[model samples]
Target: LGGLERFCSPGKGRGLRALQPFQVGDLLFSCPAYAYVLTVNERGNHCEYCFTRKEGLSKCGRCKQAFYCNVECQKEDWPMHKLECSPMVVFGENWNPSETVRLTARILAKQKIHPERTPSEKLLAVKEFESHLDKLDNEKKDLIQSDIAALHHFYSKHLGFPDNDSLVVLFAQVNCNGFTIEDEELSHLGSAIFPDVALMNHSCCPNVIVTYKGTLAEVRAVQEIKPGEEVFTSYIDLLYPTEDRNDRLRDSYFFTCECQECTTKDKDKAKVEIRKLSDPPKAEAIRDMVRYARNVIEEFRRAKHYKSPSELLEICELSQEKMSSVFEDSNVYMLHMMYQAMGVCLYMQDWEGALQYGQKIIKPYSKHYPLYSLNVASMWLKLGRLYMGLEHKAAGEKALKKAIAIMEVAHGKDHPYISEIKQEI
Candidate 1:
């Protein structure tokens, strides 16, 4: 903690730096939420204020849009909620804004009211936030600008809008600078535009990982980081080969990554153990399934709520059979199958089935995912509980130990995960 500071590289832009050597599992920094919104379905399930899921939540009497578990949480969230609470707040009458609009409005309202703080003072280091506005097509840019104007209109209708110029920049800011908020099990619950943590830059192989603990954004070292080393976090999935990672990073962030992994490794050439495709048509089908199935999975995940895809199980079953014949245990797709099966079973509350799929993943997860990633640590914790529930003591203990080791770095020593793991021990 004593040895860390923020620094900007001329080409790569800003990122965190270590001024002294730090071991694995050392916490680097933590920050509170500036502005965030829960996914619509999640608002009913989790308290809008504390981000906690508790039963018998009370709704706001005027809007009935958000729910809270207790008076304290209701009070805590009211300041933000008050601005956009009612249909009546939209002056034209009987109107609703999309979640993105509401979230941007909340940020705009905070910036506008009180006149007590500058943009930097009110927004906290938001000046450096990326717009990536230049990268968008005219159609996309026009859509976003229209959304900003509508949001500004609402602000003026209700709480009185500030300078239109001051508010317009926020639309691009939120588009470029939002974080995916996930629950304990790695399910994405919402997104937040917390400007403070955006300074951390991207690397193909990151030295640190970010995860949410309630409303806080935490950054932790993945492995040993030496003094003066640049600390990086991956913005996209590391499982992809270089070309795919390049395409996504360029499109999403408007930068090309020349990280060590991109520059040096031939990701395709790494899998020597996967046998040659003896059956050409079958191999082609398998590849198609992986691409299409992964897309369907992503679509399912991004939606606020949806029924499970029955086709997912059948495709994954076929993929597993193909993978078993064509590949060894460590094939990334072999691992990908186990993860797919794990999600399918968990959705059904089939704990025993989930235990089997969870078992299949840990080995491959270790091979593919970074140690500091929420994906690996969350899977470890999932298996830890699953094994414990099935009366598998030795396996449960081992899984719990793995989860704690990663999560302790993801969060610090006083983290609630430590308490839970100790209880398991």
Candidate 2:
């Protein structure tokens, strides 16, 4: 109930609405936070805050904004200061903030910066340099190598940052931006940031959209929302087919999504048909068939395929019918196809259908994913949204409250997602 009365909508998601009618181009709330500068080169091992380079010195090299007498001292002080350091390093010389800086700061503070791990005793103590693709199986291993090589060549030779391997690795580690960076060499270089927006959960139509104001970031509402509404933001471009969205999320963030937009089942047949028609006739029949199936599935999704409870049930039935003939169930594409059907069902505006589909997708994911994982939080948020849509205002508020708690623990209280969700509920 904190700050709820002032801005909360009874059944919509958390957001601040005009108490009375307001004009376009009206002023919104201004963000509250501070920004600072860090000198990477001059402070060589000095106290970050005081810039004291004297003996018995310890400091944060990346942000150059903290001071410590020893490891214990640093550890004791970190809870308060780490938030700024992480973003300072990740954003590097390009740190920027709009309304989202506090949220960004919270995310940065909560990230687990694994200090270089000690290697197992199987080999020489000399640090072993394993290829980035070493973890993959033979077939996938080659793909990993190729992707890495392509990324490297593009960044180094084409982008003219041949010696920027460290920077490249840093970027890869915290990838968040969704733009395709393969075009020009360093064109995608600076896109990486400390807090990963890519890990956000999906909604076919999301409530919050991120806008960049110079280096500053802002989260804006796409519609009027009520209190207890689950705030959502898209990770990948929402314009893509469900299959593509699932593929990118899984490959990039290492998670399988079960969001409402990804769980519908009936629309897959349409997607398959679209794929078939989109393919060239001269291609192998098997290839064409596969393409057709995928495209048909996508088509159903585009048409609001699960706008009713009956449509959702039909999707489930179709999924069962198509299971044996289609690709493997666990394949990213196949999973996405099903998810798309399920997602549409959840959004059909029927309380029973929304609850049934919502639980079907969310319950299992909650069990599998870590509590703080974005997947779990998003599921809770979706549940909140469903409750609100169904006129279960109190229940919806409860669910949204849980979502905010999870996000606060995972990111931070001030993280953009939290603020945005707060504004919604």
Candidate 3:
């Protein structure tokens, strides 16, 4: 009677398999988080409980830390928030818990209050999550040790802390399994552990796409699935070169991905294509460009903490200029810099500038990301809204329509959002 069944997938270990035929746009299942936390960046913009964005959110009276859309949501989340409220008061400004540590505390507390697992979790128990401890180096192990120290310092009073060995395994479980929940526009909202969603193993060429509705994880079939077929979702961005994708998968999940994309690597050259110069650069020059592209991207991320919109936009301008000297507009690195530029311009209401960067991004994004990708759909949505706001009705209509075509598959045909966009068009 169920839509999904757990099976010991041959090479991928345990995984979710389709129990019935499903078409594109079909939602295989929806999963609720076992534990989740709103990110520090999203604290004021989103509700701590429901995780919706709205103006004028109410703050928790005791801790004055968490924000909520209303008292009911605040109450619903109180049982979980109650554990940390008092300590937040004690520490004041010194109260800083990483998202991983916060999520771990709730997981620990939840195990005490309700030892039962939800139906989805029955397929993949939290404790059953792999640690790959042997694969982790001392440096990574040391970081988990620090997280455990914070867990004891932050949560020991409310709940009896677990032994170091148990806590280490839990922390490592989160590091590898935690989901970064993002909004419809794909902005970061929080981090969560959805044990059920984790049952679907990784594939470089994934057949399903996972989207979030607040704390719920929605898994939709991007491609049709036949009965008994295993489902796969990508663990890393597919836009990266195959080697880069494999390296990230290996480092974090402790395995080399042998998916079709990884083994074939048919898309790698296009992903890193260079703008051909009259005289092509030597091998040494190409290597230097690659190094510069990566380092600048890292620096841009670090600068987010202190940089102003103007400052960040300037960095994007300089980086894109340097990249355009060698890299084609479709290169992932070029796209990365341009995306940052568009985001900053939108934040500053520089509509023309945002549109320019956004228009340049659409083709590369569409080419690289998989069919029915939520990321591609979101970009189209953004551009459509931006175009409509500027009174470019025809262009706006076309962009929104393009977005709806993909969203129909990624978000399902009947999602309220599709209706809303239909009216807007």
State each model's C-alpha RMSD to the native: 4.1, 19.9, 1.9
Candidate number with greatest TM-score:
3
Off by over 4 Å in 3: none
Better of 1 and 3 by TM-score: 3
Native-to-model Cα distance after best TM-score fit, residue 142 in candidate 3, in Å: 1.4
The best-first sequence of candidates by TM-score reads 3, 1, 2
lDDT, candidate 2, 311-337, per-residue tens: 655755575445424443433344444
**Whole-model alpha-carbon lDDT for candidate 1:** 0.71
Q: Which lDDT tens digits does candidate 1 get at residues 1-425?
A: 34677777668766667888767776777667777777776868988887878788988877777899888889988878786676434443455566778787777666555335332222236555777665777776787778877776565555665465545556777777777788767887787766656767789788887777778787777779888898787787776567667888876788889888889866544431355666644656656745654564455455314445566566667767755765665666566666776788787688998888887777766766655777788888899889889889988989888888777777777787578686986
lDDT of each: 0.71, 0.43, 0.86
Off by over 4 Å in 1: 1-4, 56-58, 88-99, 114-124, 142-168, 266-273, 276-311, 318-329
Question: Better model by TM-score, 1 or 2?
Answer: 1
The TM-score obtained by model 3 is: 0.94
